[PDB]
Amino acid sequence: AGINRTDQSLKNPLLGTEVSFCLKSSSLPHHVRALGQIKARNLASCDYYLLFRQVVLPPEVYPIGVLIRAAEAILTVIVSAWKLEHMTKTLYSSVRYALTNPRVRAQLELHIAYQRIVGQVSYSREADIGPKRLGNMSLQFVQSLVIATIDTTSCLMTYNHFLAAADTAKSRCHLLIASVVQGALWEQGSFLDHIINLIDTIDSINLPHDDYFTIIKSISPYSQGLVMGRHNVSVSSDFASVFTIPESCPQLDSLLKKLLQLDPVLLLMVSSVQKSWYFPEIRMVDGSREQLHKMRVELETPQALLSYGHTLLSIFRAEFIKGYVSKNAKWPPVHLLPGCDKSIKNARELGRWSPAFDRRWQLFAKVVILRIADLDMDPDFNDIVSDKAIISSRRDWVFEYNAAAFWKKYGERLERPPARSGPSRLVNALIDGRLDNIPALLEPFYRGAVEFEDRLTVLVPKEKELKVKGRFFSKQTLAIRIYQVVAEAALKNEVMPYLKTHSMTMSSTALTHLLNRLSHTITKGDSFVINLDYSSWCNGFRPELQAPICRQLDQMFNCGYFFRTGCTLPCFTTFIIQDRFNPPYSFRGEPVEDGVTCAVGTKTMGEGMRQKLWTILTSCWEIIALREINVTFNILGQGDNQTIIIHKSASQNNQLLAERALGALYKHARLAGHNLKVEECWVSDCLYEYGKKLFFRGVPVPGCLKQLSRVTDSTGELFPNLYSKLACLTSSCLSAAMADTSPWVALATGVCLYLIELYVELPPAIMQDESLLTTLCLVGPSIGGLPTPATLPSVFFRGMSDPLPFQLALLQTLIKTTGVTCSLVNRVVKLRIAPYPDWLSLVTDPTSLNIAQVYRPERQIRRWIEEAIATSRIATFFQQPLTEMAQLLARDLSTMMPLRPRDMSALFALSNVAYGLSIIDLFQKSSTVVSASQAVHIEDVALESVRYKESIIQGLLDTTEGYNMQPYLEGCTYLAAKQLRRLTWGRDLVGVTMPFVAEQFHPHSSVGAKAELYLDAIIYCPQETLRSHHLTTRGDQPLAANLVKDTLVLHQWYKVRKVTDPHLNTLMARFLLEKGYTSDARPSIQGLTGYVNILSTWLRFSSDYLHSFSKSSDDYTIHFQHVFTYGCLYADSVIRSGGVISTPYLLSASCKTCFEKIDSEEFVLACEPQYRGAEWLITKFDPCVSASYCLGILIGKSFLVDIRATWANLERFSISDMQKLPWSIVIRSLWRFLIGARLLQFEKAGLIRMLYAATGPTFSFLMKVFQDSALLMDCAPLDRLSPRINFHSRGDLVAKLVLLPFINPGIVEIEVSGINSKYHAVSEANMDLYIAAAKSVGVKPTQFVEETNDFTARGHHHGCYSLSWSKSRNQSQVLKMVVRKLKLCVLYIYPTVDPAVALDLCHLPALTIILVLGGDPAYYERLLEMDLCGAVSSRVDIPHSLAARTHKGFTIGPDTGPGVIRLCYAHPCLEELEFNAYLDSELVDISDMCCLPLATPCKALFRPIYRSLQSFRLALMDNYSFVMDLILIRGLDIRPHLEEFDELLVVGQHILGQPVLVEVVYYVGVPVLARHPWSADLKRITVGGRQGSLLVGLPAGLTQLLIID
Amino acid sequence: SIRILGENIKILDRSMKTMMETMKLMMEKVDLLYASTAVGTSAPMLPSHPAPP
Amino acid sequence: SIRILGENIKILDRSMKTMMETMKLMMEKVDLLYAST
Amino acid sequence: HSDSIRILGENIKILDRSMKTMMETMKLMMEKVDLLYAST
Amino acid sequence: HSDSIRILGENIKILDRSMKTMMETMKLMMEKVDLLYAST
């Protein structure tokens, strides 16, 4: 009758309340059939774990050797598709060894038997199925209850307990397979033996279940306590000694201590697994009362809580005002309180931040933040869609529980539980028409009135969490979910970038910087890292001190009583406990509060609710508690777990500082409503966890034991089938490997469970043939087959990729390597094309083809859900099928002259049509659990399940082919993908071809490579030999209105490249008209994947593709993050295989055809649209110089904040477009910002201090744009400036160039006339628009050779200078003369030479440079970073230099060797021979090569010391004028700058005629400068190591500097 | 006559910026007692007036 | 100069309108403080 | 200055009407906030 | 038209008087609301 045994995997809580109902006082027939099958010796529902330990199976009961050989074949094809023969053996030998070890094979054949029984009882309407033999037990299933008996002892359980047994065998299949693979893929030995001993120990504990599972829960905190108690050099902690593991189980204590003595990291990985053993029920009778109590505990008096919360308001106002001054660069309005400090009012009027405000937060209790922005009522569309189910109202709570349990507990039938009572999905009820008007939805929340149907939260225990009393997650109503999304988006968009604590937690660059501050301060050991884990962080927030920071948040966003709703709303919502077959009693349709099954109103909201508020609140109490004790500190706040860097002060020792800090934290956090024990909240200097990743001394433990053994709900929103079981396994491996799991272990486990899932749901005729299993594995979802964990490269890379060449490469490797004919592949695939193009599936998914596979679940999809919601503004959305307008618009887009599906999808997403299709797609894929499409219409889709099983049987067994895929699979794969796209769509597709990067780049090693053979390559190089410790410890090298705005962005993108199409502009105007805007024109606008990034801190890389693709102005279809990630994963795979990365390697191109230039062609639409607008789907001067002028002032305001501590994120721009921009205007705009700023005495000191040294992220960016400098020569200030001042280094040159308005008024008056008022009015938000005009209209920079001294034969002496300011000039002089003497076309230089010396060898014309890098781009990056003319980028042969390890010619850099250039003399060109250059370990006279007349010179020659004296006299005026200002600069110690000015003074004193003293007494005071003392206040400065027209027009200070003493 | 009166309007504006700040201080003391006393036995709270965004 | 201070007195009126709307949002919570206490 | 002075007087008069209404609001809110120690 | 300028200048003086008597009552309801928050 009723359909039974719904779930195929566990997604429900585990209580034997149904078992207690069957065992006590029942009369229903299913309890009668369950009581009749149990034996006399019956284990209870708590003791199901004792049954399955004793279960031995008759060995090799399933002949799964076909699956073993298939796993070896599949994994061989996968890891040969990446062309990796070393890591293949460590996978298939490990997979074989798991399938050979008797305990692991016993668990896996147990799992095959379990899931075969599940697949034979899933959706069985028959009440009792026959007894089936599993191992040695006999299984019998009645209703939702399972009876298992081994020999004489039976165990009655629910079907969720049987699924917990099945998923426990599945979990141990995960854990043992991943343990054998990890022991194969990690340098320490295989811990499979320790897992077997741990399983035997955990199964051998004969204790009562609650204390037993307390041991199982506390296996991880006690292990962390052991690691702490062994490795706390700075502190002493009582964290380990509380847990009773030595007293309850001596064997497990011995095992844990043994694991401690082997490796703490491996102990943490073994501790990290959650429910790989038997699922520890949910323990409602004690554990739920614990949780419902932890929620509502009261720990502190309300007066102290409110006083401390107002102190939190003081610090939050101080931090947000600091953020607003730092970001908006102007002050927010400041109150004038009688009793306010006058310093705050003076800081308001001056417009600058006071350093004394940091340690004095209390005065900010008088000063608030005025309204700065408006609240966005409509939410972001992407974050509402997934990862959380809802309840529709308060009437939909009865669906989760069983009516029979309510009948046996209270005698009632739970008010019709099969009543649906509205659509239970999130987004189906969201745009149902009730709640589609989101501003009117949150208008009650804007009023603060909450609907009675909203206030209900369902608390659900989750499978696979190591806690045993049951951690619950929050499941609220739709309106509260929309409220949470809007509030968290409003905090993330605006509040977090201002706050200095949480701009770290949002911005990835600041997160990297703060994690680096974590890493350096934990490796030095000076600053301690406390990990303050709160047991009830989600439950410790109170109504009295939630200290919600919401008050102020409400005033800044121009709303009233919106954010203040979200602190009382923890107490508004009624919390109920979802228990399977254990319902809370219904009073009047609502559950009644008992303290066990339901708690009507708790003082907190749950987990994941009000997260963004509560993180800032916790950070506020940590800032107060640590600034009352005067320490320096940084906070990372994950939420429930907190990590604080605290720096050691000189006043207190480290242990005393930490004990005082913990006393202060306990005192203030007790006033924060979080009463903390020593065992609950603990100090550390080694262990800290942020972002759900545990670090011990900066070593992250691999999560491969935890997230691989992590099951989701699965089979959601469809009929149960093989296709989405394999696709859901693929998504589980994806979500594991994005969140720090090794992709090789995840891929191998996915292959093994893929083959097990094939074994469960296929007849034995298929399963006896190895070739058919391999070919069924390697088809993929894109071309007409089953989804596989093999077929996504997104497991190894970012989210966006083109799967199609990778699918073709997997098939090609299947046909070529494994002995399978192509006709067999066509038999498996059966390629059937659609007769007509379904263009909507192209514009929604660019990579999707026109073909229709039968393995995909064929629900009606487009209209079935629409007919369901029509039967049950919903009319305006769904009276017209939007696929009609979508197909008409996309047919019009198909009449493009070049066809680009990315551009078609972009112009689709501009329309309201794609908004309607996204409404439809969320009605298709709601991502809720079971309750919207899995539950609805279940009778007619069980027949579809059997039909799809028979269909895959018929398709696999029938050898009749579909379309012959041999023409596609022959030849190259990118053309094959494009031709398949043309053949299924009827028209060729351009712009969507992203080739497989391993097909594109196939790695080798530099010692295995030949330089002239090998191609253009994007490679790495390590700094040390790497091992297991090097994978873990970090290294040196670093790591709607919006629719209207995007419509304007694409319209101005059309306008900026100067293309006008009447059809395209007409269609874009139609888009503006349907959005409600009448006017046609409106004037308005190295992180990698994180898993493998730690290895990349030891590695170095750059974009070395410039010899094939970057030299053209056209862009290409190369994604460089994917190339870098592939190189990191190859290094990671070689390390984990057992070898080491000592020799640097290479990623060289193998498929030269596969690189596709994207066409520089605009698209013209041939056909006018027939859309005519909708208006129902929505309810309510040349640009190059302006972009240059915005770029200059943007660099100026970026440099402005660096002296206070890029700023405007300038690093997210391509270097090529910046090189296209004219940089004459940028330098004038950079100069004028400091004139317009007029900074005070203190900031001008920092401008001198930090920029003469090579420091600054903005400074490094402006070096990066000037890395090749044709921008420097074409700039009109700089050819004038180069005679004037003495540029010392490039770091000196750029710093002098930016600070010229501050240091010299003379240069300002030359360029003061080039000011324009309308260029001030051009905003920065147009600049990233206008840089597109640089891309197409803007010509490339000339890359001109600013020729230095070419040194051929003889010539007249012009000075012959090369780094004469600091370095030994003769060292580079003799190198230029040696390479001209040898007449080398090709020159070799080792990285031991100073990079500025090997810089000057690249300015010689007709000299190809092949540096002996051996793999290292760092040396070439340094000597590219030293140039000022850009000629180094043209004469260094990067593919020959970058991949060559050994010496192949004349090498500069070895100290002694064959074929090695190594480092009186009456020579006119050089006055002396400082360095003797030896060739072939032999001395050769250098003097024959002399100078020549030259062109305009690069910055190696230093134009001021050349023949011109008037510019050097101007320089002698300028440096004394600099020093007179800098003495007057307050807080600036002029020791190095006085030394620079004194070097200029000695260079002047050679010309002034007075004798030069070697040591000058040089009395310095205020400013006057002379050797003789003018007055007593002058200070002696010790400098060692040291016509008449210049006297005309000489200042009096230089007259003092003229005469000695 | 116009300029001295314009200075008086500047005094009006300088006091008005202070008046904008006084109320914005003075919400945040009863804001936290509305936050505080939310003990939530049955949790009904009825706000006074509707508000436009 | 008359029109400049004419707009300047109008923005002074707009600020008073916004303060009145915000201070009536202040009213809705002491009313529920009389019920929650 | 036939048109500017009259509308200037009206634009000052509308603020004169507005600030007395907010003064009445301030008196009403003073009446509300004197009940705070009547509850606590 | 300088006579109406003097009339609206007197109105500016009335606006100044109203702003001062709003500062007074805001100070009183500053004091009362601030002495609320210590007791709860």
Ligand SMILES: [Zn+2]
């Ligand atoms: Zn190719």
Ligand SMILES: [Zn+2]
């Ligand atoms: Zn250069």
